[PDB]
Amino acid sequence: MNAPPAFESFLLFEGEKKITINKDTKVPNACLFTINKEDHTLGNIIKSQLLKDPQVLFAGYKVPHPLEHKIIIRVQTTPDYSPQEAFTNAITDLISELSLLEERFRVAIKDKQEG
Amino acid sequence: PYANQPTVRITELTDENVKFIIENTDLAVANSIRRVFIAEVPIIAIDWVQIDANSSVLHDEFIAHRLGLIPLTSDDIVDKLQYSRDCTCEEFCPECSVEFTLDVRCNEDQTRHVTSRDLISNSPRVIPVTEQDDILIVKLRKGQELRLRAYAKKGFGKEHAKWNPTAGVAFEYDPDNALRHTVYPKPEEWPKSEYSELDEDESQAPYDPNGKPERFYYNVESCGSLRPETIVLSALSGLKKKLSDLQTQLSHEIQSDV
Amino acid sequence: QPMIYICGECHTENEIKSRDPIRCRECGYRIMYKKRTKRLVVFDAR
Amino acid sequence: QTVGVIVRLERETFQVLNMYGKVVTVRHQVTRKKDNRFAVALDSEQNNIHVKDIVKVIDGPHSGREGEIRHLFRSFAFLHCKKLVENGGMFVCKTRHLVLANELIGQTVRISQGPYKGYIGVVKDATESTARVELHSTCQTISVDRQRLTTV
Amino acid sequence: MIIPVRCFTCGKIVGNKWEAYLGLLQAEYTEGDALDALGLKRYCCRRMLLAHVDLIEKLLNYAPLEK
Numbered sequence: 001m002n003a004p005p006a007f008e009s010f011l012l013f014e015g016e017k018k019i020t021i022n023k024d025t026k027v028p029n030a031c032l033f034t035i036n037k038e039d040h041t042l043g044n045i046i047k048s049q050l051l052k053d054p055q056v057l058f059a060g061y062k063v064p065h066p067l068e069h070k071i072i073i074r075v076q077t078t079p080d081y082s083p084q085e086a087f088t089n090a091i092t093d094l095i096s097e098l099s100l101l102e103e104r105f106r107v108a109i110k111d112k113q114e115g
Numbered sequence: 116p117y118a119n120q121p122t123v124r125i126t127e128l129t130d131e132n133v134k135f136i137i138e139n140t141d142l143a144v145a146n147s148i149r150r151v152f153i154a155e156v157p158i159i160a161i162d163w164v165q166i167d168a169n170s171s172v173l174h175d176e177f178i179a180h181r182l183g184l185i186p187l188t189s190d191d192i193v194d195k196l197q198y199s200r201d202c203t204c205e206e207f208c209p210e211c212s213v214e215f216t217l218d219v220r221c222n223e224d225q226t227r228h229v230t231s232r233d234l235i236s237n238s239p240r241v242i243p244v245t246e247q248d249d250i251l252i253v254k255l256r257k258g259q260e261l262r263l264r265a266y267a268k269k270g271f272g273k274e275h276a277k278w279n280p281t282a283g284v285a286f287e288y289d290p291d292n293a294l295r296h297t298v299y300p301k302p303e304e305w306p307k308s309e310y311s312e313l314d315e316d317e318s319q320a321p322y323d324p325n326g327k328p329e330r331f332y333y334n335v336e337s338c339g340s341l342r343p344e345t346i347v348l349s350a351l352s353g354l355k356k357k358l359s360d361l362q363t364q365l366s367h368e369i370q371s372d373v
Numbered sequence: 374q375p376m377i378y379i380c381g382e383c384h385t386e387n388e389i390k391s392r393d394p395i396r397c398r399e400c401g402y403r404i405m406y407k408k409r410t411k412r413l414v415v416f417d418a419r
Numbered sequence: 420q421t422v423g424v425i426v427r428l429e430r431e432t433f434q435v436l437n438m439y440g441k442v443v444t445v446r447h448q449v450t451r452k453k454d455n456r457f458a459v460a461l462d463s464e465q466n467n468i469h470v471k472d473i474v475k476v477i478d479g480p481h482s483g484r485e486g487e488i489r490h491l492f493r494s495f496a497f498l499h500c501k502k503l504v505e506n507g508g509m510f511v512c513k514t515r516h517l518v519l520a521n522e523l524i525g526q527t528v529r530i531s532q533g534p535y536k537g538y539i540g541v542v543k544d545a546t547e548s549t550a551r552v553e554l555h556s557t558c559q560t561i562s563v564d565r566q567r568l569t570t571v
Numbered sequence: 572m573i574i575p576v577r578c579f580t581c582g583k584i585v586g587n588k589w590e591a592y593l594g595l596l597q598a599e600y601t602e603g604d605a606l607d608a609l610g611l612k613r614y615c616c617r618r619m620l621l622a623h624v625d626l627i628e629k630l631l632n633y634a635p636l637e638k
């Protein structure tokens with residue numbers, strides 16, 4: 001009846017931005033990144049990578065509601081260093097270690113299947 | 116300020132499962148690779164069932180349900196198929212779907228088992244996985260029949276659980292809880308893990324405050340729809356693709372702000 | 374224009390008319406079962 | 420082809436005044452037409468007029484009288500006047516001689532574009548733009564564009 | 572009624588196990604021996620056959636209404 005269709009977890013629509021940047025006004029150098037149609041399987045890795053910068057003062061994410069598919073990643077970085085730069089470095093660092101991990105997994109398969 | 120270098124050590128590789136150890140990565144990376152095993156790996160599963168005729172004791176939606184959950188051999192086709200809703204075809208084509216046909220009438224006094232073998236593909240690579248016996252779809256009395264045409268399409272585990280390639284993804288870090296994330300009331304009663312390395316005198320490892328979760332032990336058992344290593348390769352490729360599309364939208368939004 | 378009904382206990386099929394008393398021809402069994410429709414059905418396998 | 424307006428209630432007949440101005444005597448078993456109380460008409464001076472409007476007749480056979488609009492036609496208007504004792508006050512003039520003082524319904528369709536692509540349903544409601552489709556598979560009726568539908 | 576195709580928790584394909592499970596019961600094994608002879612290690616996959624009732628064999632006794 002009121003069952004949301006199964007493609008509401010990941011498909012966007014016309015007039016939905018995937019990412020929305022809203023500059024926080026409470027503290028200096030902080031942004032809320034609203035990711036639409038994602039879940040913990042993106043924001044948890046981004047949160048853990050943003051905790052590895054020595055220049056991020058706050059790195060968190062929450063879902064507002066588990067029935068509505070969006071997360072908010074709040075980033076507060078050190079001044080002189082934009083939080084958008086920390087975010088676009090976190091994504092590149094994840095792509096770096098995942099491509100390295102995929103190549104090492106390939107090499108481990110070639111080791112295992114060929115003795 | 117950068118990503119640590121993970122490493123993989125595979126303990127076994129069977130046609131059912133793969134058991135491996137990922138060292139020198141964070142916890143959230145490891146949990147996400149588990150969650151992308153469960154959800155974000157795309158396989159091929161039946162999603163469009165047209166019942167031409169049915170006389171069986173099971174009703175139509177029960178048979179279409181049971182045809183949903185049958186695993187299909189999608190080891191190399193699912194990288195070639197487009198998602199059905201993304202294709203520019205006239206609503207079905209061999210680039211986003213695999214046709215199956217079932218046509219069974221029972222003309223004998225024995226109970227005839229419509230199994231997974233009676234699903235006949237037009238694509239010779241995408242066939243049902245069933246040494247092992249076939250997957251029982253419906254039994255038939257004499258006189259009953261069922262004819263149907265079923266299109267299978269690419270999808271992943273968030274959409275529906277019939278696109279889930281994994282039977283089971285066991286995942287554990289720190290099997291003697293030196294980290295003390297879990298706090299046992301009486302650790303003598305607790306059985307040791309498979310990956311424990313303490314002697315039987317000792318219950319759990321001594322606490323270290325400076326430690327962090329590393330050396331994540333995985334046991335990925337496939338259901339048969341994929342080989343258990345191409346689940347892991349497809350998962351890593353899908354997670355890197357999700358992150359890359361998030362970065363592209365991020366670049367668009369930053370260029371929109373400036 | 375005639376509707377085909379399945380003859381209950383007999384399991385055979387027969388025509389029927391408007392304003393026709395409902396009877397089988399084999400044994401006059403009173404319960405008819407209407408045949409499955411000819412238009413298409415399509416199920417999402419979810 | 421021609422409407423009428425009852426001007427006298429009798430025992431077995433009605434006295435009915437049509438758009439032609441011809442008082443006729445017809446049986447009880449004429450049909451009741453749905454009246455358009457929001458219908459628009461134009462006078463001789465291109466001003467918008469409606470029902471219950473006091474209009475002067477400047478041309479035609481009734482030129483000089485002034486009556487209230489009670490019913491409307493494509494090109495005719497019926498005028499009531501309590502001073503005029505004929506026909507209960509009713510007459511008719513042409514409106515240009517006055518001055519103010521779906522197919523897709525119930526058709527098995529197949530969504531051929533979008534997120535619901537490949538679903539068979541039956542169109543419940545339909546517009547120029549969108550159409551509501553009773554889906555055969557789910558327990559839910561959803562609306563899609565007509566450009567996304569393809570009939571069987 | 573009929574055997575589920577997947578174990579509800581895991582998704583392990585258990586629908587192909589039922590007739591072989593009946594064969595291993597009638598070949599004088601215990602139920603616990605028959606389950607891990609079919610290779611069901613997790614107990615959530617063991618309840619799927621251990622507590623199935625094959626009710627469709629009762630439903631096939633009745634003559635089919637349509638013919």
Ligand SMILES: [Zn+2]
Pocket residue numbers: 199202203204205206207208210211212
């Ligand atoms: Zn296509």
Ligand SMILES: [Zn+2]
Pocket residue numbers: 380383384385386397398399400
């Ligand atoms: Zn008969």
Ligand SMILES: [Zn+2]
Pocket residue numbers: 578579580581582583613615616
């Ligand atoms: Zn299970």
